[PDB]
Symmetry: C5
Subunit: 311 residues, 5 copies
Amino acid sequence: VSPPPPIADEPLTVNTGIYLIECYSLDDKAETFKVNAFLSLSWKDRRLAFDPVRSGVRVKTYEPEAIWIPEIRFVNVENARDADVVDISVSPDGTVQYLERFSARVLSPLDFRRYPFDSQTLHIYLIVRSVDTRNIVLAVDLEKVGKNDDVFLTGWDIESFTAVVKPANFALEDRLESKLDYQLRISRQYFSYIPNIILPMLFILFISWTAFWSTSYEANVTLVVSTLIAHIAANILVETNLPKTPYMTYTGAIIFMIYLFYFVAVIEVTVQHYLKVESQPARAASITRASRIAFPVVFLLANIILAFLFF
Amino acid sequence: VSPPPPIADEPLTVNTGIYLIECYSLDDKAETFKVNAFLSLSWKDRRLAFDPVRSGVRVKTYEPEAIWIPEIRFVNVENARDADVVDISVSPDGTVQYLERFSARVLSPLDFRRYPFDSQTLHIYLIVRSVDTRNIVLAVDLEKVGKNDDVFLTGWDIESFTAVVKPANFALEDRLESKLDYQLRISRQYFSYIPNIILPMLFILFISWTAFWSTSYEANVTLVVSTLIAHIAANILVETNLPKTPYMTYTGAIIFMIYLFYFVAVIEVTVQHYLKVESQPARAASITRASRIAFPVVFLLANIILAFLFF
Amino acid sequence: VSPPPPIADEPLTVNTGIYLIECYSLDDKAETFKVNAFLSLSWKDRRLAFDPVRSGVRVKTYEPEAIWIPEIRFVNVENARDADVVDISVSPDGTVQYLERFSARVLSPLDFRRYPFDSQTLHIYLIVRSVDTRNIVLAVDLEKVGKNDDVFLTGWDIESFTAVVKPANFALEDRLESKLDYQLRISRQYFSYIPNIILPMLFILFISWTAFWSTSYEANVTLVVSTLIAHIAANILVETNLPKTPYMTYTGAIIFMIYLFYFVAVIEVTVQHYLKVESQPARAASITRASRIAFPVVFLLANIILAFLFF
Amino acid sequence: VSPPPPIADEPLTVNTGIYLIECYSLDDKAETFKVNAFLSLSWKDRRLAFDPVRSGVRVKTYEPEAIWIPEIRFVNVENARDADVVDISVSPDGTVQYLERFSARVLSPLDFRRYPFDSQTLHIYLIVRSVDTRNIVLAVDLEKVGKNDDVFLTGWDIESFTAVVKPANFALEDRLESKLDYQLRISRQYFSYIPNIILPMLFILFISWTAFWSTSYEANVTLVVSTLIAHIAANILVETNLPKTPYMTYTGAIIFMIYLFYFVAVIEVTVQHYLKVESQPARAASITRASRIAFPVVFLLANIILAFLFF
Amino acid sequence: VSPPPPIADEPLTVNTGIYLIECYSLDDKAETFKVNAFLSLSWKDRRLAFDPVRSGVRVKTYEPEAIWIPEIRFVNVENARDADVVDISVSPDGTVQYLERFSARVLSPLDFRRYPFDSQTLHIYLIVRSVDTRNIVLAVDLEKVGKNDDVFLTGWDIESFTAVVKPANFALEDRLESKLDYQLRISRQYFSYIPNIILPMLFILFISWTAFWSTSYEANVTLVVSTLIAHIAANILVETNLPKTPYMTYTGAIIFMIYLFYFVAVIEVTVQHYLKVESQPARAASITRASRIAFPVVFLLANIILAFLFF
Ligand SMILES: [Cl-]
Ligand SMILES: [Cl-]
Ligand SMILES: [Cl-]
Ligand SMILES: [Cl-]
Ligand SMILES: [Cl-]
Ligand SMILES: [Cl-]
Ligand SMILES: [Cl-]
Ligand code: NA
Ligand code: NA
Ligand code: NA
Ligand code: NA
Ligand code: NA
Ligand code: NA
């Protein structure tokens, strides 16, 4: 239980693989997700080599305590992973094939710019620290990188689970470190957002524009103010299931824009009533008739502009 | 502590059984449930066999550490199950009888299409990985698959707990794996939904339709807008205790449909008032008289159509 | 570390006792409560017999690992109890006096039918499984069953903590099981419900009935609709701190009934206004005058009927 | 590892001390707080005594496993404390000086009667159970009872941390117990409540009284009903961050009282409008003029009476 | 094992370093944050020294159990840190080089005075307790104090991670304690607050001021009361994601100030209507015309004064 000694000076290559069994709990606010997978490790330890003719056995099995196992860690985990060693198998040349099943909560930031029409790349960073005896370097065994078909992430579509085969080798606290990037590409299922948030929010907005076909100040006040309160409720509901991004999001922009439409509707409703009382309803009539075209046209154009900027 | 060697080449059959003690916390949003149950395992290990005459006993009790025990895992669990070995017994022929009491949090997706009138099938997937020495295969001891009568899942009816006797055998990372499916059939207790959500939601809708017996634009605006806000409250309350499904649900469809009825009520209320001011209340009267029959008839038909599609 | 041998054939009697130290976290929605308590166990194991003359000590102290201890489990726990052995004391005859302090989240269903004026029976089920060597049977040492006086369950009154002395002996997976029932009788402190939910809910209802002393449709609409929205808020607040019962509760029935009173108030307010416009205010006047007596009388009469059904 | 033997028959005195390192998470609803502190224990074990001149060392250091340590427990804790032994020091005469750093969630009930102007006494109960060999009794080393100056309990002022030096000695399950009471006196920082809950709640009430300077039934209805809804929101916000007390609180009384003021305002608004329609506005005028003085005077007196009762 | 003996009487210097790997979960209400990092420790233990010539190795590796390791603790943690020893390396002169990776929940109070435009200093306090044999003293190895570039704290900007090199040496429970202060300077990303809370809150305020261009008491009541309710919603949303500070905050002051503007708007709306009915609309007109300038001017000045006080 010391690292296998080098034949020349070559670094020790630990081949890795992650096969996702379960994928759950994608918290958008926390930018965390829970994972359940197999972690497979392989390396050559010549000290464990044997003759398969005389030994009679093709493969020897070991307990973790018995042999040297490289200390593999995840970079972006909340706490150290919960692992259970499934199997350790040594080949006649000394090739070790370690398999463990684990659970871990991962920290991977999300890009909310195109929400709820966004895609994400979740990351799992494998890392190994070199020892004074020899330098450990990570590799990807593409044959042992995969995902169970049943893997389902609620409200998301799992596109691919790949690994960037070239590790990031760098110095950290005067020792070499080999980092691997496992990428899980997922896209958001936006269907639900349409009948639940998008269309209800557009209807409460259009209801506010019926004030352009009424001369009743008392009714218009109620119309524009009541629907504005519904939009505040909408804004809270949306913003409370999202983190505070230092950048502007698509849904962020739209919600904001709709507040300006309410502010300008209130100004129109006020102007129309002022002119009515000022005994000049002809100006009030032409402003109201204009608003009937202006408001939907400007709304539809502002939206085209916004969608264009964000997509 | 190596797997029992094969007489020929036949795979080792581990007979299983799950007897549910407590069933709780069915989270609809998370699509998870917690289970507390006995796991029983039985397999032949000829090396453990003894003569009852010489040994003076008919059963031999062992500690887990003492003998080979197959590594059984649950597929769809959040974290590895919390288990406590109840007993290990060996018959004279080497028929091992293992029993453990466990608790796990299980991932089992739900079909919200007919919610709150839905039935579900919860799954418990048992899996064993074959070893280099020999191939392990799972079986169901139907005599040891059950549930306590006291088992109660709050707001659900437990219909049955059965096991699909033929395991799913497949290759995973060049080793055989034997998977068993334990199914817990349940159906939702929808009674509470009727006096709490369904009838209150229909009453706030009918209150909106009293606007078809009023000419007061100011009162109508208030009646349709206020009741619309109550429906938004309803929609939030409902949608916050459900996951974001990529498919349309029955409750989803109904809530959505009711938004259209509110939008058309607002349009009618607007049209009637416009015509009043335009000094043609006869047109306004005939449209309002029509709405009194149209709105309930279209509502009741749309509902029959919807129920028909979903059931 | 195997069970003690019988002198004849008699089952091994493990005497039990539970003394409650801290009772807390009664979750009505989950139907769970947390309990911190002493668990005391006593049995005779003649193998541990000693002559204090030789041994010098009159009672021997042991570590759990050192001697055979019966596997006692709780049936209705979420997860296995967190226990810390306080003391294991053996007297010369081999009597083991085991004491441990534990914490556990117990699953005990509640009857919400008379809520908030309900009383409950919480259950703690002790179980022991028989071994092939000899049958273990539970007993209650009434001297060691109790509760600390300081034990306080927030918003509840603790009446009694007793044990059903005769254990439920039954077969389970071809072995005998001895089950004991510890009952904790409690009753809800309903005082807070009166000034916080009951009286505020009756006042918002009576405010709606002031519409029977007004002819202003616009004011009546606002009165009945605004107070109805307050009742929806009330209903949500109440129902979100309760589980979805398949049966009708007292508070459930009352909340429901009050919705009908709002629906009939809206109908009256509509009918009165229609008749006003139809230029027949004498009919409208007599209906409104009737409603002033009808509404409180029917409300008081329906409440008497409801209280009578539920209590 | 047995308790130190008595010279005569005197009970073994374990001197205790708690020094609070960090104090946090005071949950008012749960009536729990999280603590992090040093627990110090000191007793004489003559067996461990050594020659100071002949052993060369003045103080011997031991590992917990090596010597007898009294089993000290907290009464009012959720689960057993998480402890890490800092140091064990044996003096030449056998005085053991044990130190450990621990964290626990303590259950200490609160008196909400004068909330948010209340002061509290948090309790930490230390307990030891006597053994068959000899009786253990607790004592307070006042020199080792304290708190770090940096100790901060958010929204509270820490007044003192003292210990009631005379332990509660009593019998429990036929063995002596020695209980000690550690008291943490704190008083609530009520400043925030004034600009956030108190003044906003009084303004929405005074806004409802502007109805006494209006003859517009439709406006008064809106004024009194709208502000009443704001008070319901207030009441929910307040009551959801407090437990259901079986006694009346000061904030409880005030919130309740304000509901009666709203009920009487609605009655006045109704009476004034009835009289207007009944063509007798002179009676309506005198009732309204009276209400302008009556409402603030009765409000200010009811408050003086309430404050007097509660303080 | 015991601490390394002094050559003269010099205290043992443990050099420390913290290199932040991942920084997450900054709870403003709890004033806690979660940290994942490397802790590096280095001291000289002459007993572990070896001749590299005869040994053949230029360094020696040990298991924690094998050698003396100083008991380093964090002061301001919730619970004791979860640590995993990465590596222990010994140089030929007996210089130990210890590295561990840990995760802990750190308590560090925040200054909410300039929120959401606030910057903070998070603290990590390292402490070691001296022993009777010798005094242990902490030091900072500035070369081993850092942070990964990828370290991201959601909704915050990480400015610097430094250490106050001179430790706080003081007595605690009659033993000397060496305390080190690690400071993490961060500053809040306030962008999101502008389109989500600030601008929506100003628009609902300006909408209430359109009442100064209306004579309709009914429409004014609705305008000022409805927008006031939106401000209450705002106030709750803001205050529920903040702790109850015993001091006034900037956002606290602004929210409060806006309540006074609503109160004075209600008074103006009341005064204007009273004067209208009193048949003196000229006074009402001049008060209303004044309010149109007074309200924005006083609002803009009050804000300049407030910003000036807080910044
Ligand atoms: Cl890890
Ligand atoms: Cl498992
Ligand atoms: Cl296959
Ligand atoms: Cl295979
Ligand atoms: Cl248990
Ligand atoms: Cl404890
Ligand atoms: Cl620590
Ligand atoms: Na190893
Ligand atoms: Na084994
Ligand atoms: Na044992
Ligand atoms: Na000990
Ligand atoms: Na209104
Ligand atoms: Na050590």
